Amino acid sequence: GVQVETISPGDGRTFPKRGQTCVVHYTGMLEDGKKFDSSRDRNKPFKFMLGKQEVIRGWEEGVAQMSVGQRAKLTISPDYAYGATGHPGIIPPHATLVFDVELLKLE
Amino acid sequence: GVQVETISPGDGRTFPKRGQTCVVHYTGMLEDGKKFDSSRDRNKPFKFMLGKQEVIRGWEEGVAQMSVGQRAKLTISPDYAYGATGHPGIIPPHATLVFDVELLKLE
Ligand SMILES: CC[C@@H]1/C=C(\C)[C@@H](O)[C@H](C)C[C@H](OC)[C@H]2O[C@@](O)(C(=O)C(=O)N3CCCC[C@H]3C(=O)O[C@H](/C(C)=C/[C@@H]3CC[C@@H](Oc4ccc5c(ccn5C)c4)[C@H](OC)C3)[C@H](C)[C@@H](O)CC1=O)[C@H](C)C[C@@H]2OC
Ligand SMILES: CC[C@@H]1/C=C(\C)[C@@H](O)[C@H](C)C[C@H](OC)[C@H]2O[C@@](O)(C(=O)C(=O)N3CCCC[C@H]3C(=O)O[C@H](/C(C)=C/[C@@H]3CC[C@@H](Oc4ccc5c(ccn5C)c4)[C@H](OC)C3)[C@H](C)[C@@H](O)CC1=O)[C@H](C)C[C@@H]2OC
């Protein structure tokens, strides 16, 4: 499933409602800590809308449990990411993904 | 140890007292460029009291010698930061840290 280990607190009340835009800063890494991507390097946060086919299942369930301002370690099991087909390039098959996500704001 | 590089000229006179609240803004990155945190992006300045063990050694000493209004680049050595274990998911062990901290004001 999708794991959520909170490390930094948000407001603990405002959770993204289905249909809102999420502005997050993340760092995705392989099970062995290999940083494969990071929005913090591009200095541009990732803006995705909740509900529509925009994020891998893990992100859909994970972020939905987060509150504005919170930062957590999402450990997404293979079946909730790509796993099967994997992802040409940096995501090998049946890979467990760890995401350091900081929910910046909800619009 | 810890190196302090005065980026912006501060007050030159007002320095933090053991017990006061330092209101700062900062970004954190590693020697290899990679950033890992930024209060500026989340629009919420970091507040902490000096000498109350609310922050790591580097910040404790490095900030203690920063006058108000001053913006400095802190080059904290692992033993003053998280030398032994680092910080799970975000900081690796033995890593040296670079902090762009701006002393906004005191409380
Ligand atoms: C430019 C394109 C466009 C990409 C952008 C907007 C970029 O700007 C953003 C910043 C993405 C990054 O670009 C640097 C980069 O970020 C990663 O590094 C990453 O960190 C990541 O994991 N992210 C991104 C952050 C949210 C979680 C996850 C994601 O959700 O990303 C989404 C993703 C990659 C989903 C897979 C697509 C293929 C499906 O498989 C299918 C499904 C249907 C299919 C086929 C084939 C035919 N059909 C019909 C295959 C998979 O289904 C499990 C799901 C991604 C955001 C898409 O929604 C949108 C895009 O495609 C990815 C490792 C690879 C990704 O792209 C490099
Ligand atoms: C609970 C969440 C709480 C978080 C908040 C309130 C957030 O709002 C604030 C804005 C922090 C940020 O959250 C986005 C985030 O900021 C970083 O990104 C960062 O930039 C950083 O480096 N910062 C923060 C800015 C000041 C300097 C430094 C710090 O000082 O941060 C402090 C820190 C991380 C100290 C370590 C604590 C454990 C000790 O281990 C010990 C030591 C002694 C011990 C034990 C166990 C028993 N004893 C006696 C364990 C380590 O010992 C070297 C030192 C941080 C402010 C903690 O005081 C309080 C928290 O962690 C960290 C990379 C990770 C941290 O998120 C976590």
Short mmCIF file of C-alpha atoms and ligand atoms in Angstrom, two decimals:
data_model
loop_
_atom_site.label_atom_id
_atom_site.label_comp_id
_atom_site.label_asym_id
_atom_site.label_seq_id
_atom_site.Cartn_x
_atom_site.Cartn_y
_atom_site.Cartn_z
CA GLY A 1 0.00 0.00 0.00
CA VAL A 2 1.08 3.62 0.35
CA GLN A 3 2.98 4.39 3.57
CA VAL A 4 2.96 7.83 5.20
CA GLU A 5 5.65 8.53 7.81
CA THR A 6 5.18 12.15 8.86
CA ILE A 7 8.37 14.08 9.66
CA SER A 8 7.17 17.69 9.59
CA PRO A 9 3.69 18.86 10.73
CA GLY A 10 1.10 20.68 8.67
CA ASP A 11 -2.10 22.20 10.05
CA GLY A 12 -3.62 18.77 10.70
CA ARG A 13 -7.05 19.96 9.55
CA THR A 14 -7.00 21.08 5.93
CA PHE A 15 -6.69 17.95 3.79
CA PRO A 16 -6.97 18.42 0.00
CA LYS A 17 -10.59 18.04 -1.11
CA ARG A 18 -11.21 16.06 -4.31
CA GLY A 19 -10.81 18.64 -7.07
CA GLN A 20 -8.19 20.99 -5.61
CA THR A 21 -4.78 21.87 -7.02
CA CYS A 22 -1.80 20.73 -4.95
CA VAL A 23 1.50 22.59 -5.01
CA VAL A 24 4.16 20.22 -3.71
CA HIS A 25 7.93 19.92 -3.51
CA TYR A 26 9.22 16.36 -3.64
CA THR A 27 12.26 14.17 -3.97
CA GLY A 28 11.71 10.70 -5.32
CA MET A 29 14.25 8.01 -4.49
CA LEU A 30 14.61 4.27 -5.04
CA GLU A 31 14.35 1.79 -2.15
CA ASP A 32 18.14 2.05 -1.73
CA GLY A 33 18.01 5.84 -1.31
CA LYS A 34 18.95 6.72 -4.90
CA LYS A 35 17.58 10.20 -5.67
CA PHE A 36 16.19 9.80 -9.17
CA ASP A 37 14.30 13.11 -9.38
CA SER A 38 13.67 16.27 -7.34
CA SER A 39 11.53 19.36 -7.91
CA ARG A 40 13.68 21.22 -5.39
CA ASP A 41 16.53 21.28 -7.91
CA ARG A 42 14.43 22.83 -10.67
CA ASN A 43 13.30 25.50 -8.17
CA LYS A 44 9.77 24.92 -9.50
CA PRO A 45 7.14 23.07 -7.44
CA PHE A 46 4.93 20.41 -9.02
CA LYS A 47 1.30 21.42 -9.45
CA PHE A 48 -1.10 18.51 -9.89
CA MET A 49 -4.89 18.36 -9.53
CA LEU A 50 -6.27 15.67 -7.22
CA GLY A 51 -8.58 13.05 -8.74
CA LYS A 52 -7.71 13.11 -12.44
CA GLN A 53 -5.12 10.80 -14.02
CA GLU A 54 -2.09 12.93 -13.12
CA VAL A 55 -0.27 11.08 -10.37
CA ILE A 56 0.59 7.44 -9.72
CA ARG A 57 -1.94 5.78 -7.35
CA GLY A 58 0.49 6.09 -4.45
CA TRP A 59 0.45 9.87 -4.70
CA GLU A 60 -3.35 9.95 -5.00
CA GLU A 61 -3.85 8.07 -1.71
CA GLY A 62 -0.77 9.43 0.05
CA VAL A 63 -1.17 13.18 -0.38
CA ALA A 64 -4.91 12.93 0.33
CA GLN A 65 -4.01 11.98 3.92
CA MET A 66 -1.68 14.95 4.26
CA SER A 67 -2.60 18.34 5.67
CA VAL A 68 -1.38 21.70 4.32
CA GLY A 69 2.20 22.41 5.41
CA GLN A 70 2.99 18.78 6.15
CA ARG A 71 6.02 16.90 4.88
CA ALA A 72 6.13 13.11 4.84
CA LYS A 73 8.00 10.08 3.63
CA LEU A 74 5.67 8.25 1.24
CA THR A 75 6.86 4.70 0.73
CA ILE A 76 4.89 3.45 -2.27
CA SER A 77 4.76 -0.30 -2.91
CA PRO A 78 5.46 -1.50 -6.52
CA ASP A 79 1.79 -2.17 -7.29
CA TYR A 80 0.88 1.45 -6.44
CA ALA A 81 3.55 3.04 -8.64
CA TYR A 82 4.62 1.39 -11.88
CA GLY A 83 6.10 -1.94 -10.83
CA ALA A 84 4.73 -4.05 -13.68
CA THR A 85 5.93 -2.16 -16.76
CA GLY A 86 8.34 -0.11 -14.66
CA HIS A 87 9.33 3.13 -16.36
CA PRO A 88 11.80 3.47 -19.28
CA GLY A 89 14.85 5.29 -18.00
CA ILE A 90 15.17 5.60 -14.23
CA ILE A 91 12.45 3.34 -12.87
CA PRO A 92 13.35 -0.40 -13.03
CA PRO A 93 10.58 -3.05 -12.71
CA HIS A 94 9.00 -3.84 -9.33
CA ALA A 95 10.69 -0.88 -7.71
CA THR A 96 9.50 0.43 -4.34
CA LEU A 97 9.48 4.24 -4.36
CA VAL A 98 10.13 6.65 -1.51
CA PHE A 99 8.91 10.22 -1.83
CA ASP A 100 9.82 13.14 0.38
CA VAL A 101 6.76 15.29 -0.23
CA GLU A 102 6.14 18.74 1.25
CA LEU A 103 2.60 19.99 0.60
CA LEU A 104 3.18 23.68 0.06
CA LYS A 105 -0.31 24.97 -0.67
CA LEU A 106 -3.80 24.14 -1.92
CA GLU A 107 -5.49 26.36 -4.47
CA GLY B 1 33.78 23.90 12.59
CA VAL B 2 31.46 26.42 10.94
CA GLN B 3 32.13 29.14 8.37
CA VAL B 4 30.08 32.32 8.11
CA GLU B 5 30.06 34.20 4.78
CA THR B 6 28.38 37.62 5.09
CA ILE B 7 26.26 37.92 1.97
CA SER B 8 24.24 40.96 3.03
CA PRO B 9 25.50 43.58 5.51
CA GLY B 10 23.53 43.38 8.72
CA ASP B 11 22.88 45.87 11.47
CA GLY B 12 26.46 45.40 12.64
CA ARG B 13 25.43 46.01 16.26
CA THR B 14 22.36 44.00 17.31
CA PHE B 15 23.23 40.38 17.97
CA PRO B 16 21.01 37.55 19.35
CA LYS B 17 21.00 37.08 23.15
CA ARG B 18 20.89 33.69 24.89
CA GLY B 19 17.13 33.43 25.38
CA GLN B 20 15.76 35.57 22.53
CA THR B 21 13.79 34.41 19.51
CA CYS B 22 15.49 34.54 16.13
CA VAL B 23 13.11 34.88 13.21
CA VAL B 24 14.87 33.72 10.06
CA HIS B 25 14.36 32.61 6.48
CA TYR B 26 16.62 30.01 4.96
CA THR B 27 17.31 27.40 2.33
CA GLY B 28 19.39 24.30 2.90
CA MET B 29 21.59 22.54 0.38
CA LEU B 30 24.50 20.07 0.27
CA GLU B 31 28.01 20.64 -1.11
CA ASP B 32 26.86 18.86 -4.28
CA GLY B 33 24.30 21.61 -4.91
CA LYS B 34 21.18 19.54 -4.16
CA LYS B 35 18.75 21.56 -2.03
CA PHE B 36 16.67 19.79 0.61
CA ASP B 37 14.59 22.51 2.32
CA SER B 38 13.48 26.15 1.98
CA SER B 39 11.25 28.18 4.30
CA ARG B 40 10.99 30.88 1.65
CA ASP B 41 9.07 28.52 -0.64
CA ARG B 42 6.56 27.78 2.14
CA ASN B 43 6.18 31.49 3.07
CA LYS B 44 6.70 30.65 6.78
CA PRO B 45 9.91 31.96 8.46
CA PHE B 46 11.66 29.67 10.92
CA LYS B 47 11.37 30.74 14.56
CA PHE B 48 13.57 29.35 17.33
CA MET B 49 15.03 30.51 20.64
CA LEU B 50 18.79 30.69 21.09
CA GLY B 51 20.47 28.40 23.61
CA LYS B 52 17.32 26.38 24.31
CA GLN B 53 18.60 23.40 22.28
CA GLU B 54 15.91 23.94 19.64
CA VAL B 55 18.46 23.75 16.81
CA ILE B 56 21.72 22.07 15.75
CA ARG B 57 25.14 23.34 16.92
CA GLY B 58 26.08 25.01 13.64
CA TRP B 59 22.93 27.10 13.73
CA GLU B 60 23.46 27.79 17.43
CA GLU B 61 26.92 29.32 17.00
CA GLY B 62 26.67 30.49 13.40
CA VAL B 63 23.48 32.40 14.02
CA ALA B 64 24.65 33.69 17.42
CA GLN B 65 27.23 35.81 15.59
CA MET B 66 24.96 37.17 12.89
CA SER B 67 23.64 40.70 13.39
CA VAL B 68 20.02 41.48 12.55
CA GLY B 69 19.24 42.15 8.89
CA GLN B 70 22.33 40.14 7.99
CA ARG B 71 22.19 37.39 5.38
CA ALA B 72 24.93 34.77 5.63
CA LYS B 73 25.97 31.48 4.07
CA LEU B 74 26.64 28.89 6.75
CA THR B 75 28.99 26.02 6.02
CA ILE B 76 28.31 23.66 8.94
CA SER B 77 30.58 20.67 9.51
CA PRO B 78 28.90 17.25 10.14
CA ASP B 79 29.97 17.15 13.80
CA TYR B 80 28.05 20.43 14.32
CA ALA B 81 25.08 19.14 12.33
CA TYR B 82 24.10 15.47 11.91
CA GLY B 83 27.55 13.92 11.66
CA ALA B 84 26.81 10.50 13.13
CA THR B 85 23.46 9.53 11.57
CA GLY B 86 22.35 12.39 9.37
CA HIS B 87 18.58 12.45 9.03
CA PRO B 88 16.51 9.55 7.59
CA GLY B 89 15.28 10.17 4.07
CA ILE B 90 16.64 13.71 3.81
CA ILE B 91 20.23 13.96 4.99
CA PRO B 92 22.89 11.22 4.54
CA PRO B 93 25.53 10.55 7.25
CA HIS B 94 28.78 12.61 7.35
CA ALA B 95 27.29 15.28 5.07
CA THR B 96 28.37 18.90 5.28
CA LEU B 97 25.53 21.45 5.00
CA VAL B 98 25.22 24.92 3.49
CA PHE B 99 22.48 27.17 4.88
CA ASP B 100 21.36 30.46 3.35
CA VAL B 101 20.01 32.12 6.47
CA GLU B 102 18.62 35.66 6.80
CA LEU B 103 18.21 37.07 10.31
CA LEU B 104 14.92 38.91 9.86
CA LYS B 105 14.32 40.15 13.41
CA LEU B 106 14.24 39.41 17.13
CA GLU B 107 11.52 38.65 19.68
C1 LIG C 1 6.17 15.52 -19.91
C2 LIG C 1 5.21 14.38 -19.53
C3 LIG C 1 4.46 14.60 -18.21
C4 LIG C 1 5.50 14.87 -17.16
C5 LIG C 1 5.47 16.05 -16.54
C6 LIG C 1 4.19 16.89 -16.44
C7 LIG C 1 6.72 16.50 -15.83
O1 LIG C 1 6.87 17.91 -15.98
C8 LIG C 1 6.65 16.08 -14.36
C9 LIG C 1 7.43 17.04 -13.47
C10 LIG C 1 7.19 14.66 -14.17
C11 LIG C 1 8.72 14.51 -14.16
O2 LIG C 1 9.34 14.99 -15.35
C12 LIG C 1 10.71 15.33 -15.07
C13 LIG C 1 9.10 13.04 -14.00
O3 LIG C 1 8.94 12.76 -12.63
C14 LIG C 1 9.28 11.50 -12.14
O4 LIG C 1 10.69 11.61 -12.02
C15 LIG C 1 8.56 11.39 -10.80
O5 LIG C 1 9.18 11.85 -9.84
C16 LIG C 1 7.30 10.83 -10.57
O6 LIG C 1 7.32 9.64 -10.28
N1 LIG C 1 6.14 11.46 -10.62
C17 LIG C 1 6.08 12.87 -10.86
C18 LIG C 1 5.53 13.51 -9.61
C19 LIG C 1 4.19 12.90 -9.23
C20 LIG C 1 4.33 11.40 -9.08
C21 LIG C 1 4.91 10.74 -10.33
C22 LIG C 1 3.90 10.83 -11.47
O7 LIG C 1 2.70 10.59 -11.26
O8 LIG C 1 4.34 11.20 -12.72
C23 LIG C 1 3.48 11.12 -13.86
C24 LIG C 1 3.93 9.87 -14.59
C25 LIG C 1 5.34 9.81 -15.12
C26 LIG C 1 3.04 8.88 -14.72
C27 LIG C 1 3.24 7.61 -15.48
C28 LIG C 1 2.97 7.74 -16.98
C29 LIG C 1 2.91 6.41 -17.72
C30 LIG C 1 1.88 5.44 -17.12
O9 LIG C 1 1.97 4.17 -17.81
C31 LIG C 1 1.14 4.08 -18.88
C32 LIG C 1 -0.22 4.40 -18.76
C33 LIG C 1 -1.01 4.49 -19.87
C34 LIG C 1 -0.42 4.27 -21.11
C35 LIG C 1 0.93 3.94 -21.29
C36 LIG C 1 1.28 3.80 -22.62
C37 LIG C 1 0.25 4.01 -23.52
N2 LIG C 1 -0.97 4.34 -22.46
C38 LIG C 1 -2.35 4.67 -22.81
C39 LIG C 1 1.71 3.84 -20.13
C40 LIG C 1 2.16 5.26 -15.61
O10 LIG C 1 1.11 4.50 -15.03
C41 LIG C 1 1.60 3.81 -13.86
C42 LIG C 1 2.21 6.62 -14.92
C43 LIG C 1 3.62 12.35 -14.78
C44 LIG C 1 3.62 13.63 -13.95
C45 LIG C 1 2.45 12.38 -15.82
O11 LIG C 1 1.20 12.50 -15.14
C46 LIG C 1 2.54 13.61 -16.74
C47 LIG C 1 3.53 13.43 -17.89
O12 LIG C 1 3.53 12.40 -18.57
C48 LIG C 1 8.76 10.32 -12.97
C49 LIG C 1 9.55 9.06 -12.62
C50 LIG C 1 8.87 10.61 -14.47
C51 LIG C 1 8.35 11.99 -14.83
O13 LIG C 1 8.53 12.16 -16.24
C52 LIG C 1 9.89 12.10 -16.71
C1 LIG C 2 9.36 17.23 14.91
C2 LIG C 2 9.46 18.09 13.67
C3 LIG C 2 10.22 19.39 13.88
C4 LIG C 2 10.11 20.21 12.64
C5 LIG C 2 9.62 21.45 12.58
C6 LIG C 2 9.01 22.09 13.81
C7 LIG C 2 9.66 22.21 11.27
O1 LIG C 2 8.61 23.16 11.23
C8 LIG C 2 11.05 22.87 11.13
C9 LIG C 2 10.97 24.12 10.26
C10 LIG C 2 12.12 21.93 10.56
C11 LIG C 2 11.98 21.54 9.09
O2 LIG C 2 10.80 20.82 8.80
C12 LIG C 2 10.43 21.12 7.46
C13 LIG C 2 13.11 20.60 8.68
O3 LIG C 2 14.28 21.39 8.62
C14 LIG C 2 15.38 20.76 8.02
O4 LIG C 2 15.10 20.59 6.65
C15 LIG C 2 16.51 21.73 8.20
O5 LIG C 2 16.66 22.57 7.31
C16 LIG C 2 17.34 21.77 9.28
O6 LIG C 2 18.38 21.11 9.19
N1 LIG C 2 17.01 22.47 10.34
C17 LIG C 2 15.77 23.25 10.40
C18 LIG C 2 16.11 24.72 10.51
C19 LIG C 2 17.06 24.95 11.66
C20 LIG C 2 18.30 24.07 11.52
C21 LIG C 2 17.99 22.58 11.41
C22 LIG C 2 17.46 22.06 12.74
O7 LIG C 2 18.08 22.27 13.78
O8 LIG C 2 16.27 21.40 12.73
C23 LIG C 2 15.75 20.76 13.88
C24 LIG C 2 16.17 19.32 13.79
C25 LIG C 2 15.79 18.56 12.54
C26 LIG C 2 16.89 18.81 14.79
C27 LIG C 2 17.33 17.38 14.96
C28 LIG C 2 16.39 16.66 15.93
C29 LIG C 2 16.86 15.26 16.30
C30 LIG C 2 18.28 15.25 16.87
O9 LIG C 2 18.72 13.91 17.12
C31 LIG C 2 18.76 13.59 18.45
C32 LIG C 2 19.47 14.41 19.33
C33 LIG C 2 19.32 14.26 20.68
C34 LIG C 2 18.45 13.25 21.15
C35 LIG C 2 17.74 12.39 20.30
C36 LIG C 2 16.93 11.51 21.00
C37 LIG C 2 16.96 11.63 22.38
N2 LIG C 2 18.04 12.87 22.53
C38 LIG C 2 18.39 13.52 23.82
C39 LIG C 2 17.91 12.58 18.92
C40 LIG C 2 19.24 15.90 15.87
O10 LIG C 2 20.47 15.92 16.57
C41 LIG C 2 21.58 16.43 15.82
C42 LIG C 2 18.75 17.31 15.53
C43 LIG C 2 14.22 20.85 13.91
C44 LIG C 2 13.79 22.31 13.92
C45 LIG C 2 13.79 20.16 15.21
O11 LIG C 2 14.22 20.93 16.34
C46 LIG C 2 12.27 20.06 15.31
C47 LIG C 2 11.67 19.12 14.27
O12 LIG C 2 12.29 18.16 13.79
C48 LIG C 2 15.79 19.43 8.67
C49 LIG C 2 16.74 18.69 7.76
C50 LIG C 2 14.54 18.58 8.89
C51 LIG C 2 13.40 19.36 9.52
O13 LIG C 2 12.28 18.50 9.55
C52 LIG C 2 12.32 17.58 10.63
#
